[PDB]
């Protein structure tokens, strides 16, 4: 597990480095801000219907009466530009605040704990998470547990022994064709069927798919020996 973790991080470094848009989210944020700034600045060069885009010329060249209406048009256009910029910045800030709330939630529930929410922190059974600072953002290294080598098995809901149904206390009844074993759900670790890891819940008649098998009794050997 330690080697797999080390190799995983070593691959994370290369995958971040090589991919053209690994940090595309933060790059898009920066680009959106830069383009908003650039369009706001370039809006000073727009006439807005006035006969001049440079304003030191419209006032001096024109008479104060007409210069007043020309400056009115220019101020209306530029204040429209400012209001549009502020509204777009408010919408973008709401989007960024939603993302920052999600980042705070992910920090709290995966860096500061182990989350059982599926796919919230990485694809797989979440194990850990490591925050990493990034320009105007955060990068989480979601360490997850992915089962790898599945294998077919014959399973049964219960085990009929001594005329009473037996259910796995924690795990699954499986058989390798001939012998019946109880196994934890996420990792093939066959165990001999025993009264310790099985609990009796009635008779064999009710259950559909119950298989007839023997359940080992730990106490009998000590009584015999």
């Amino acid at each position: 597990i330690a080697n797999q973790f080390n190799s995983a991080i070593g691959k994370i470094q290369d995958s971040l480095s090589s991919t053209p848009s690994a940090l595309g989210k933060l790059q898009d944020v920066v680009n959106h801000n830069a383009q908003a700034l650039n369009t706001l600045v370039k809006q000073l060069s727009s006439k807005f219907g006035a006969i001049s885009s440079v304003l030191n010329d419209i006032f001096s060249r024109l008479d104060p009466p007409e210069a007043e209406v020309q400056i009115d048009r220019l101020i209306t256009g530029r204040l429209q530009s400012l209001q549009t910029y502020v509204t777009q910045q408010l919408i973008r800030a709401a989007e960024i605040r939603a993302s920052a709330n999600l980042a705070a939630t992910k920090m709290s529930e995966c860096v500061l704990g182990q989350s059982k929410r599926v796919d919230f922190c990485g694809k797989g059974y979440h194990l850990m998470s490591f925050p990493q600072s990034a320009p105007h953002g955060v990068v989480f290294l979601h360490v997850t547990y992915v089962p790898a080598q599945e294998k077919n098995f014959t399973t049964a809901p219960a085990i009929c022994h001594d005329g009473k149904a037996h259910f796995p206390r924690e795990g699954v009844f499986v058989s390798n064709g001939t012998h019946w074993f109880v196994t934890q759900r996420n990792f093939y670790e066959p165990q001999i069927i025993t009264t310790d890891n099985t609990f009796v819940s009635g008779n064999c008649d009710v259950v559909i798919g119950i298989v007839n098998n023997t359940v080992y009794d730990p106490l009998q050997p000590e009584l015999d020996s």
């Binding site: 989210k25 980042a103 290294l141 992915v146 790898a148 294998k151 098995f153 798919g209």
Partner: protein, 41 residues
């Protein structure tokens, strides 16, 4: 040899799970995978 082609998107590889009334698949090994998630803050 090489040119732009158009096609219908392939949603993914078809994987019919071998479901059966008494067949289960318990994994025998794991894989500690690290995933990277980037979030603007």
């Amino acid at each position: 040899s090489q040119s732009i082609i158009a096609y219908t998107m392939s949603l993914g590889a078809e994987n019919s799970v071998a479901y059966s009334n008494n067949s289960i698949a318990i994994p025998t090994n794991f894989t500690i995978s690290v995933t990277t998630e980037i979030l603007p803050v």
